[PDB]
Specification:
4 copies of one chain form a homotetramer. Chain A is mostly helical. Chain A is 56% helix and 12% strand. Chain A folds into 2 domains: 64 residues, Fe,Mn superoxide dismutase (SOD) domain (Helix Hairpins); 114 residues, Iron/manganese superoxide dismutase, C-terminal domain (minor pseudopilin epsh fold, 3-Layer(bab) Sandwich). Chain A is built from 9 helices and 3 strands; from the N terminus they run αααααββαβααα. Chain A has a 3-stranded antiparallel beta sheet. In chain A, a hairpin with a 4-residue loop joins strand 1 and strand 2. The longest helix of chain A is centred in the N-terminal third of the chain and has 32 residues. Chains in contact: A-B, A-C, B-D, C-D. At the C-D interface, helix 1 of C face helix 1 of D. The structure holds manganese (II) ion (MN) (4 copies). Chains A, B, C, D: InterPro entries: Fe/Mn_Superoxide_Dismutase, Mn/Fe_SOD, Mn/Fe_SOD_BS, Mn/Fe_SOD_C, Mn/Fe_SOD_N, Mn/Fe_SOD_N_sf, SOD_C_sf. Chains A, B, C, D: It catalyses: 2 superoxide + 2 H(+) = H2O2 + O2.
Chain lengths: 196, 196, 196, 196
């Protein structure tokens, strides 16, 4: 059984960068739905698997990836943000960024370009490539999780689904990206990085 | 050269079903961007084609489909709505619907299910299948146009991208679908149907 | 657990339309591989599912659909062929065909066109639309199974992967299609149809 | 206008690694088809573009990518092979390889794994990442060209469509991969690399 994780702060904690209304809808409505739908889908899949019903297993793939991915992506997202975030990262994460992207500002531009360039709904990802041993930026459509579809280990995710910024920034996705840098929890990104 | 078409009514004409703010953003910002980006992309494609640069032609495919599709989809959408719409269609369109879906209410359920079931951004379409000679419902991802990708002739389109309802209905997509039936321009759908 | 099904005839029973070498490789090598990889994939999915590992489940989807689909498609294919097949169908099936495609000739023309037009590897399908209650033609890429991805019930499948004809007909897919009509088991197709 | 390129050697020059029959069919039949269909598709796209027909342009995308990609991929492939090829690369290329993949052996191991793992028809590519300045391995489905869809610059391509080996190696793709290393034109690969 999967559960909706509690937010590490108060819905209004990210203001004025991300207003309380968005945080509340995004977490208590959108994320909750994914978790609920995921549990329903997993139960159906278990039955199909027990019966060896391959057709049913393949028919359920879209619902599982969408809801399972929705749950995974958001759980990481909440930990990537903090009312005490912002600024730049330090330690070896910082040097990894300089080494792989040239500079922190260059990295920001790269991830911002990837995020803003998503057609429709999606996510912009900084991830870690275990095979090559370096940082890598990637964009994923809809709710397709980073690791499950690309193999990259997620470090920092940026949700560019409209439900993440439209109420406040409307059609100006770049304004949203500009504001989010102020609440990035770099200690969390560093932990995730040191883990892999 | 492609142009942003004028709306056949006043931004506030669809209230209280679709508020003026959404209509204004959707038309003057979102649709305008698609048209502008389409013209820029078409010009690049013409140059690539003149030079026989196949790589450049393939690299531009996503931008052309997204913006070209955005322009096509919305141009039809505006004509599908009307402050004097609502109710049910009459004439042979109505009997085609009864014949292919059983009843008008059944048709509404079918198209509503298709529209609400879109994962991420997309469109719900009632179209005409010229090969088989009957009505057909289809859902398209993001801005993928109906005819260009499926061959079906579009009759009525329902935009389920968040920029079409979120400001007003938030995460409750079903409430939006419920309201839109009140402003469907059936005379336009009938014209499109009689044309094919 | 899934098993490679035994054939209702010997490998050379369909000559000269489809030679023995192709039948032997297709069944003992290609289908066998799918069955083996499918068993391994379900095994892993069972472990991932028991541990609630959503990432692992999503990572396994491509393999499950490809090998699971391979097993489903070929299992049906073998029954669709017969050393004493060929000719035309009779009864309700022949009636449904004339009604949905005009005539047996047009149906054949349509299925052939759908099969030859597949870009790369895939399958051409005559299917049954349970929702609309009519016959329908569809093409699927690689091993994507008909019912699992489109909802249509499979009645007759034409494998257009190179391993189904290349040794005998080389690049001339049209010659392959022309020949296969001589070994279609209409009795089995009729059976599948009546079950709808 | 696009033309079928003449080969720098005769069809049987690569034996016994790749037999003459395969080379003849692959070049005079498969590549020829792509070139012919590509010319027809560009012709139609030019008409659609002049009339501002966005629907037609989008409908033509699948054909342009498939045949255009087919032409691009095979044109490069022929230059990647040589009757006096084989062995290992030298100079900067060999340096870059060891640096990005540990050693020539690991690189070979990686490219082989990527090529054999392709589900259905496709290509395994050694490419150059102009943005990151390092070598990269990638696999592409059907005829999707490397640069047009991933941005990577192609250096070496391995065609894993059945029409490239089936007549000789049947279902044993690994045997095909093992053999092709004996006819790789490292001189041409080095040339493409130095051009970056
Ligand atoms: Mn979200
Ligand atoms: Mn819209
Ligand atoms: Mn097969
Ligand atoms: Mn080839």
């Amino acid at each position: 059984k999967h559960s909706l994780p509690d937010l590490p702060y108060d819905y209004g904690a990210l203001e004025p960068h991300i207003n309380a209304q968005i945080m509340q809808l995004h977490h208590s409505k959108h994320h909750a739905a994914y978790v609920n739908n995921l549990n329903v889908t997993e139960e159906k899949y278990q039955e199909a698997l027990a019966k060896g019903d391959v057709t049913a297993q393949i028919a359920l793939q879209p619902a599982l990836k969408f809801n399972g991915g929705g749950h995974i992506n958001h759980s990481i997202f909440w930990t990537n943000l903090s009312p005490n975030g912002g600024g730049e990262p330090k330690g070896e994460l910082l040097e990894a960024i300089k080494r792989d992207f040239g500079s922190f500002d260059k990295f920001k531009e790269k991830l911002t370009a990837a995020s803003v360039g998503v057609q429709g709904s999606g996510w912009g990802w900084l991830g870690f490539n275990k095979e090559r041993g370096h940082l890598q930026i990637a964009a994923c459509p809809n709710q397709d999780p980073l690791q499950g579809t690309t193999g990259l280990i997620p470090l920092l995710g940026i949700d560019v689904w409209d439900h993440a910024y439209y109420l406040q920034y409307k059609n100006v996705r770049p304004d949203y990206l500009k504001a989010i840098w102020n609440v990035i929890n770099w200690e969390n990104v560093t932990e995730r990085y040191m883990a892999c």
